[PDB]
């Protein structure tokens, strides 16, 4: 491939796509939570369910999306999905009857994001081979910037318009993504038979259970009997900025580690993520707690950004789409079941110091799993046993 030149506009499209998708998926939930803080709940336990249904629909639909990207092209899918998402976000403006809004926001939106998101990762590989880590790092950092700036963006520019009407504004971003999707240009379970890939997929899936809880459920602890001077917004924005920096750095470092050896980064990040969370209840000293949270933000980059390059390395470019699709398919149920499990474990034990103790087992187990991923040379050695 060109490995440069024109390939720097595709990064712009991918950054825009990821930023818009996740910015909407977080801002809509946050804004409805604010509205519920301002308005009555009359449905109550289902209204908060939307923010999880729509998110989970993205990952739970990827397995089928991978048979449209690989069967039509990285452009047509990435534009039709954006069009569907635009239509979904447009009709949501009407009266918010439970079932009607439920459908219009969980089956039109979210489902369209699944079509408009998986192609945003495949195409980059088709433009970078030796620098792909750098491109992925840049894209992840830009998407983090976009997400962290989006809810504030719509809030400030929203002009304090009512939620039902403000759904129309978000519709424009999907249309722009549809137009920007024009920039993309092309330059079954068979994949599971590769043991070296299936074991890695299992290792990633196991650590999902312990990734969402500490990364999202964190503020409850400082809201629960510990914090006296909270200013937690500072903590959250610090974690976001450090996650951006970590993603940017991890993108480049993978450029250095040759070939399959990259996976050792994932092991060293999973182990430290697991250990750190276990130290959050113990390192109560607010300065130390802030430092540990800062570390948590940095550890994020190695977790997510470096997954796509390793996926390309393991199976090459011709099967990157299917492998990534079936990897994202397995992270839906483990990821979406974590927060409820922690929030009911706090009830089982009655104090909110144990959720974190549960938050460190899944990722350490996953790290133990990844450490045994066979080397290509060793896998060949076993292959030499065929005779």
């Amino acid at each position: 491939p060109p490995e440069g030149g024109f390939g720097w506009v595709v990064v712009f499209a991918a950054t825009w796509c990821n930023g818009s998708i996740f910015g909407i998926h977080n801002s809509v939930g946050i804004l409805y939570s604010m509205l519920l803080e301002e308005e009555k709940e009359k449905v109550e336990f289902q209204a908060a369910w939307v923010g999880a249904l729509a998110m989970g629909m993205i990952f739970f639909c990827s397995p089928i999306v991978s048979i449209f990207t690989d069967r039509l092209g990285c452009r047509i899918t990435a534009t039709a999905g954006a069009a569907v998402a635009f239509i979904g976000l447009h009709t949501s403006s009407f009266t918010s009857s439970l079932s009607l809004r439920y459908f219009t926001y969980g089956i039109l939106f979210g489902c369209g994001c699944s079509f408009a998101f998986q192609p945003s990762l495949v195409i980059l590989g088709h433009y970078f081979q030796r620098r792909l880590g750098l491109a992925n790092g840049v894209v992840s950092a830009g998407s983090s910037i976009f997400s962290m700036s989006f809810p504030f963006l719509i809030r400030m520019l929203g002009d304090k318009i009512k939620l039902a009407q403000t759904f129309q504004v978000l519709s424009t971003f999907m249309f722009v993504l549809m137009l920007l999707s024009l920039t993309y240009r092309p330059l079954n379970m068979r994949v599971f038979r590769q043991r070296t890939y299936r074991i890695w997929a299992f290792g990633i899936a196991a650590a999902a259970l312990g990734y969402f809880v500490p990364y999202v459920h964190l503020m409850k602890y400082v809201e629960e009997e510990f914090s006296e001077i909270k200013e937690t917004w500072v903590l959250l924005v610090c974690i976001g900025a450090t996650s951006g920096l970590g993603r940017l750095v991890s993108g480049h470092i993978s450029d250095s580690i040759p070939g399959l050896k990259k996976i050792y980064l994932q092991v060293l990040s999973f182990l430290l993520l697991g250990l750190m969370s276990m130290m959050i209840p113990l390192c109560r000293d607010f300065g130390g707690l802030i430092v540990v949270c800062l570390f948590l933000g940095l550890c994020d980059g190695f977790f997510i950004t470096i997954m796509a390059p390793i996926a390309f390395e393991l199976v090459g470019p011709m099967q990157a789409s299917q492998a990534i699709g079936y990897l994202l398919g397995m992270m839906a149920l483990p990821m979406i079941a974590g927060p409820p499990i922690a929030g009911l474990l706090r009830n089982c034990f009655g104090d909110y110091h144990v959720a974190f103790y549960f938050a460190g087992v899944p990722p350490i187990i996953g790290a133990v799993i990844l450490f045994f991923v066979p080397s290509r040379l060793e896998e060949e050695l076993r292959r030499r046993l065929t005779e």
């Epitope: 080397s375 290509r376 040379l377 060793e378 060949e380 050695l381 030499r384």
Partner: nanobody, 121 residues
Framework: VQLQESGGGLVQPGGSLRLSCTAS???????????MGWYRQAPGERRVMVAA???????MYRESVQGRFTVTRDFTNKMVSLQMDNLKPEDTAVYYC?????????????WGQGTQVTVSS
Amino acid sequence: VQLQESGGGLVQPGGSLRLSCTASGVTISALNAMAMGWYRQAPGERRVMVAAVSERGNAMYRESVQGRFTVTRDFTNKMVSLQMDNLKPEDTAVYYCHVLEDRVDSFHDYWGQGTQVTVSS
């Protein structure tokens, strides 16, 4: 690059044997990213691997010999060592020392002349 011939031995049942080989012309840097081991060819049997040691230092074994024969990398001397214990009459075979190289297209192979190993029945 070639592995010098070595090995062999006639032993009684239950006996032990020690073997090794030498790598000629290989640099220590070139030795890394490669694995070394041994192969077996019993009467009427095709040349099949016995047990080797990977680049990471661990060893993969064949079903019929795992837990019976042991080897080590000996990377320091650019050599390889093989040892045996509790040999039995059916263990007789011609053992060939082989070295596999890491190569992007396909792993490259070196192997010297093996020697006959027989256990008296």
